[PDB]
Design a protein around this ligand. Structure first.
Ligand SMILES: CO[C@H]1CC2=CC(=O)O[C@@H]([C@H](C)[C@@H](OC)C[C@H](OC)/C=C/[C@H](C)[C@@H](O)C[C@@H](OC)/C=C/[C@H](C)[C@@H]([C@@H](C)[C@@H](OC)[C@@H](C)CCC(=O)[C@H](C)[C@@H](C/C=C/N(C)C=O)OC)OC(=O)/C=C\C=C(/C)C1)[C@H]2O
Ligand SMILES: Nc1ncnc2c1ncn2[C@@H]1O[C@H](COP(=O)(O)OP(=O)(O)OP(=O)(O)O)[C@@H](O)[C@H]1O
Ligand SMILES: [Ca+2]
Length: 360
C-alpha cells in the first residue's frame, strides 16, 4: 500500500505518492466559489466569476472549510485516489499551533477516513532530503520564510525565526518597480506575468552597489521578455533589486532583519556546542531560494557576521523547490517510520490529541 505525501503551502500544494521522484501534482493553494467550488489551476483561470480564498496564510491554515476543499481536490481530482486506501503524510509550518495539528488530524480521519496519517514539519523534511539530520534550514516559500535549526533529527523550537517576507512580496515589489520604469503591471493577470519574469530572470547580486553601478552605466545586465501579446519589455537592475529585498527588507518598508541576519540570530540562540555544526550545514529550501547567486551571497553575508575562524557551508540543492515534498516521500518510505503513523484505530480510541503523542 502506497503512502500519499501532501505538502500544503501558502502558494502551492505539492502532492504525490511516496517513492516518486517529485510531486505529481503542483497547483495553487486557492479555492474559488461562484460547479459549486473550484480549486487550483481551474480556480485561477476562472477567477473572473469566482471569489478566491487563500486558506493558508504564512504557512498556517486559517480557513478549515476551504482547506477541506483543497484536500478533497488533491485526493480525488489531482491524484485520483480513494483517501480511505492510503496512509497520508501531511506537512506543517514550524511553530504551527497545537489546535491546528488537532484539526488537521480530525479532518483526515473523520472527513476523509484515512487509514493512517502523520504531520511533519516542513523544514525538517527539507533537511532530510539533503541527506542530513543536523543543520539549519532557511525555508522560503510564497508566504513565509523561517530559519529552523535541527539537531540529530529534531527541530529546536526555541531557536526558530519567522520572517513574513517571501515570494508573493517579491512578485509585488517587482510589479511596483517595473511600473516605476514606465511599464504598467497592476492587474491580477499582470501579477501572473510578473511572477514568471521573476522566476526566469531575477538573481541575487553578490555586491548590490557594484551591480547597480553596472546597470547604471551599461546594458550588460539587461534581458528581454516577451509578454503574452508579443510586446517585448527590457529588464535591467530590476533583475537583482527584486530578490535583494530578502537581504534588506526595508526596501518594501519591512522593519525586519534580512535572511542572513535571521540565520545568524537563530544559530546564536542555540547551544555553543552545536553552533559549528549549524554553520557548516546551512541548507536552503523552497521556491524563493531558487535565485541564482543566493548561496554565494549568503556565504558572503554570514562570513561577515560569524567569527573569523568559522567554517561556513551553504547547501542549495537543485531540487529545492520540492525538497520538503521529497523529504516527506523518503520519510514515509522508511521502515523505522512505519511505527510512527497514527492509525485510524488509535484516532478512534484517543481522539485528535493523539497527534501530540505521536508527531514530533
Ligand atoms: C533512495 O532514493 C533516493 C534518491 C535516489 C534516487 C535515485 O534514483 O538513485 C539513487 C542512487 C542510485 C543512490 O542509490 C541508493 C546512490 C547515491 O550515491 C551517491 C546515494 C545517495 C544517498 C541517498 C545520499 O544522497 C545521502 C545519504 O548519504 C550519506 C544520506 C542518508 C541519510 C542518513 C538519509 C536520512 C537523512 C533520511 O533517511 C531516509 C531521513 C528521512 C531520516 C529521518 C530520521 O532518521 C528521523 C530522525 C526519524 C524520527 C523522525 C523524526 N521527525 C519526524 C522529527 O521531526 O525517522 C524515523 O537521507 C537520505 O536518504 C536522503 C535522500 C534520499 C533521496 C532523495 C532518495 C538515489 O540517489
Ligand atoms: N525559479 C524561481 N526563482 C525565484 N522564485 C521562484 C522560483 N520558482 C518558484 N519561485 C517562487 O516560489 C514560491 C513558491 O514556493 P514554495 O512552493 O516553496 O512556497 P509555498 O510552500 O507555497 O509557500 P510557503 O512555504 O511560504 O507557505 C512562489 O513565490 C514562486 O514564485
Ligand atoms: Ca512551503
Amino acid at each position: 500500500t502506497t503512502a500519499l505525501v501532501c505538502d500544503n503551502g501558502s502558494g502551492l500544494v505539492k502532492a504525490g505518492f511516496a517513492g516518486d521522484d517529485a510531486p505529481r501534482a503542483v497547483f495553487p493553494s486557492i479555492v474559488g466559489r461562484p460547479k459549486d467550488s473550484y480549486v487550483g489551476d481551474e480556480a485561477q483561470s476562472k477567477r473572473g466569476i469566482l471569489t478566491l480564498k487563500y486558506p493558508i496564510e504564512h504557512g498556517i491554515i486559517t480557513n478549515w472549510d476551504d482547506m477541506e476543499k483543497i484536500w478533497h481536490h488533491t485526493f480525488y481530482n489531482e491524484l485520483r485516489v480513494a483517501p480511505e486506501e492510503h496512509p497520508t503524510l501531511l506537512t506543517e509550518a514550524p511553530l504551527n499551533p497545537k489546535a491546528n495539528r488537532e484539526k488537521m488530524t480530525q479532518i483526515m480521519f473523520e472527513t476523509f477516513n484515512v487509514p493512517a496519517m502523520y504531520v511533519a514539519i516542513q523544514a525538517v523534511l527539507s533537511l532530510y532530503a539533503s541527506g542530513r539530520t543536523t543543520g539549519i534550514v532557511l525555508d522560503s516559500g510564497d508566504g513565509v520564510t523561517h530559519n529552523v535549526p535541527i539537531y540529530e533529527g529534531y527541530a529546536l523550537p526555541h531557536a526558530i525565526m519567522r520572517l513574513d517576507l517571501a515570494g508573493r512580496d517579491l512578485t509585488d515589489y517587482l510589479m511596483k518597480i517595473l511600473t516605476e520604469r514606465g511599464y504598467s503591471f497592476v492587474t491580477t493577470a499582470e501579477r501572473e506575468i510578473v511572477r514568471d519574469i521573476k522566476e526566469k530572470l531575477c538573481y541575487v547580486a553578490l555586491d548590490f552597489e557594484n551591480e547597480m553601478a553596472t546597470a547604471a552605466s551599461s546594458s550588460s545586465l539587461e534581458k528581454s521578455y516577451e509578454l503574452p501579446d508579443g510586446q517585448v519589455i527590457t529588464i535591467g537592475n530590476e533583475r537583482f533589486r527584486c530578490p535583494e529585498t530578502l537581504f534588506q527588507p526595508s526596501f518594501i518598508g519591512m522593519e525586519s532583519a534580512g535572511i542572513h541576519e535571521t540565520t545568524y540570530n537563530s544559530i546564536m540562540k542555540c547551544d555553543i556546542d552545536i553552533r559549528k555544526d549549524l554553520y557548516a550545514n546551512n541548507v536552503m529550501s523552497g521556491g524563493t531560494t531558487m535565485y541564482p547567486g543566493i548561496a554565494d551571497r549568503m556565504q558572503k553575508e554570514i562570513t561577515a557576521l560569524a567569527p573569523s575562524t568559522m567554517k561556513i557551508k551553504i547547501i542549495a540543492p537543485p531540487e529545492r523547490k520540492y525538497s520538503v515534498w521529497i523529504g516527506g516521500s523518503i520519510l514515509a518510505s522508511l521502515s523505522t517510520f512505519q511505527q510512527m503513523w497514527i492509525t485510524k484505530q488509535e484516532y478512534d480510541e484517543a481522539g485528535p490529541s493523539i497527534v501530540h503523542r505521536k508527531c514530533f
